Amino acid sequence: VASAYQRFEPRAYLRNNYAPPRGDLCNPNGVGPWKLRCLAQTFATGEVSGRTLIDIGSGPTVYQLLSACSHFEDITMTDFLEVNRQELGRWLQEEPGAFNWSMYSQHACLIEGKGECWQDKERQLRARVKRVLPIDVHQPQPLGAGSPAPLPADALVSAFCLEAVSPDLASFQRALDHITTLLRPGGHLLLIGALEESWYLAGEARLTVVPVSEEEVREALVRSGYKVRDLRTYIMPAHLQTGVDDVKGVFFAWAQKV
Numbered sequence: 001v002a003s004a005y006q007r008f009e010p011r012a013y014l015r016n017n018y019a020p021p022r023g024d025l026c027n028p029n030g031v032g033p034w035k036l037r038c039l040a041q042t043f044a045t046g047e048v049s050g051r052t053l054i055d056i057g058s059g060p061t062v063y064q065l066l067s068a069c070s071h072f073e074d075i076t077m078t079d080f081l082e083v084n085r086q087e088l089g090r091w092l093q094e095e096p097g098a099f100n101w102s103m104y105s106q107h108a109c110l111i112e113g114k115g116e117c118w119q120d121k122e123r124q125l126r127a128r129v130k131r132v133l134p135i136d137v138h139q140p141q142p143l144g145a146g147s148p149a150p151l152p153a154d155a156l157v158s159a160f161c162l163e164a165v166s167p168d169l170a171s172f173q174r175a176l177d178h179i180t181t182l183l184r185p186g187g188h189l190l191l192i193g194a195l196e197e198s199w200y201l202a203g204e205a206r207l208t209v210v211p212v213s214e215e216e217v218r219e220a221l222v223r224s225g226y227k228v229r230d231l232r233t234y235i236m237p238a239h240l241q242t243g244v245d246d247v248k249g250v251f252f253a254w255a256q257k258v
């Protein structure tokens with residue numbers, strides 16, 4: 001795995017999953033609106049709050065934190081690759097060539113229904129993101145020892161990471177335990193991932209994925225000592241099946257550490 005990700009191309013990844021058609025948020029039945037809606041509805045309950053939040057395996061994306069940013073003042077973004085942390089930086093600093101997340105910011109504002117302009121939303125996200133750290137979910141201590149990230153975190157967010165970096169279920173379970181050590185007791189985990197997928201492309205890189213089911217995800221969460229508050233499934237429509245992968249569905253889980 002670690003070897004495969006060496007050819008991971010952030011620009012090709014973003015283009016494959018966050019540019020039209022999947023990146024076309026106008027159709028409410030798409031995977032993007034669905035993910036944003038799951039994240040928005042969860043935070044809207046007001047039951048997921050605190051001071052610090054860690055995003056596990058952020059890669060070069062920020063959509064997963066658009067609704068979250070208004071509930072946590074200290075946000076930590078992370079990733080295995082330096083190239084991704086660099087791409088993130090370009091957007092956080094508003095540097096040349098940053099990826100345009102404005103459509104997602106606008107829809108998150110639309111979905112949240114607080115009449116917030118998307119520039120304010122992006123402003124808050126850039127402000128509350130205090131650091132982009134390297135990470136390895138396979139190490140018992142993902143962030144290492146003595147990381148600037150406040151621990152234990154109040155909340156964790158991770159999208160398309162674990163299943164995309166573990167050769168099989170077992171590795172998936174350990175990686176889950178590994179990041180859970182970063183979550184404060186009683187804390188919350190918002191996990192999004194691919195269902196029954198086995199590979200996806202990112203430029204020259206061809207990544208293996210462990211095909212997981214909703215039950216396998218639920219059981220793994222429980223085994224890690226979580227209380228599954230909510231677990232949803234989104235079936236990938238034919239129109240969003242483009243050749244960049246073989247994903248069948250997408251899952252969203254809101255688990256609380258007990």
Ligand SMILES: Nc1ncnc2c1ncn2[C@@H]1O[C@H](CSCC[C@H](N)C(=O)O)[C@@H](O)[C@H]1O
Nearest residue numbers: 057058059061080081135136137159160165
């Ligand atoms: N061992 C590891 N530990 C943590 N993250 C890893 C990893 N190996 C690879 N990754 C990272 O996991 C990411 C999977 S892509 C997910 C990107 C983004 N979170 C989204 O929702 O689209 C990549 O950025 C990859 O570099």
Ligand SMILES: N[C@H]1CCc2ccccc2[C@H]1O
Nearest residue numbers: 017031160164194200245247
């Ligand atoms: N590995 C992940 C990459 C991001 C993504 C987005 C939407 C649907 C599926 C997927 C999976 O391929």
